[PDB]
Amino acid sequence: ENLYFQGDLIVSMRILGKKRTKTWHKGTLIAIQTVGPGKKYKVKFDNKGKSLLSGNHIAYDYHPPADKLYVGSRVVAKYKVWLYAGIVAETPNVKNKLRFLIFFDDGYASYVTQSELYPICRPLKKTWEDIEDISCRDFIEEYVTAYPNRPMVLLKSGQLIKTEWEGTWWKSRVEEVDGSLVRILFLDDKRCEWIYRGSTRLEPMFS
Numbered sequence: 158e159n160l161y162f163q164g165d166l167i168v169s170m171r172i173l174g175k176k177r178t179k180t181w182h183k184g185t186l187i188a189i190q191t192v193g194p195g196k197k198y199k200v201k202f203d204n205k206g207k208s209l210l211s212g213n214h215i216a217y218d219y220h221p222p223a224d225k226l227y228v229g230s231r232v233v234a235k236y237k238v239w240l241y242a243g244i245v246a247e248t249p250n251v252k253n254k255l256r257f258l259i260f261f262d263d264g265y266a267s268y269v270t271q272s273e274l275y276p277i278c279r280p281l282k283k284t285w286e287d288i289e290d291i292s293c294r295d296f297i298e299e300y301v302t303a304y305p306n307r308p309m310v311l312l313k314s315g316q317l318i319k320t321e322w323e324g325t326w327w328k329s330r331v332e333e334v335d336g337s338l339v340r341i342l343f344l345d346d347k348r349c350e351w352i353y354r355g356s357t358r359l360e361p362m363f364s
């Protein structure tokens with residue numbers, strides 16, 4: 158069937174849709190289609206290109222209130238600028254200086270503000286199940302289900318550790334810490350990366 162209304166969605170509303178590039182872009186919801194138990198959402202992007210999308214591949218073009226965001230919520234967030242999908246790993250608290258921690262679908266982790274977040278319209282029941290990379294998907298499942306039990310390594314600036322990159326271990330140094338993230342300096346390459354303190358890319362977490 159062709160619908161005009163479906164839950165809180167209405168044909169003609171402005172929305173965000175996931176493109177094949179895996180970045181998300183503004184468009185208009187031009188149709189809602191049911192095929193038995195299934196639903197699909199036709200989006201006309203602002204370049205005139207059209208996609209027929211599942212409801213987990215559209216997001217509202219507003220920032221949700223704090224009380225609708227949980228650990229495990231499926232969101233689109235500003236990725237450092239593209240909009241990219243992720244999972245809420247932390248909500249605002251004193252220890253994170255009132256920010257949201259996002260685990261993006263590619264494994265990148267970043268703190269963001271409410272104004273950098275958008276809610277996915279029809280998330281899956283197990284919100285991680287549409288994470289394409291299986292290693293990332295399993296990590297998020299474990300993290301979200303185990304929460305608030307979160308093993309993390311306690312690290313201090315100047316500390317020498319081994320960090321993973323491209324499947325091998327590298328000599329590295331902790332440059333700074335920000336909440337649940339650590340900025341690692343790869344010593345040979347002389348460049349830095351922000352990494353989650355519970356990541357098994359930090360050899361102390363792996364071992």
Ligand SMILES: CC(C)(C)NC(=O)[C@@H]1Cc2ccccc2CN1
Nearest residue numbers: 322327343345346348349350351
């Ligand atoms: C862009 C980020 C994520 C900082 N990565 C890099 O710049 C990588 C980091 C790295 C680590 C060990 C050995 C070689 C390399 C090459 N550049």
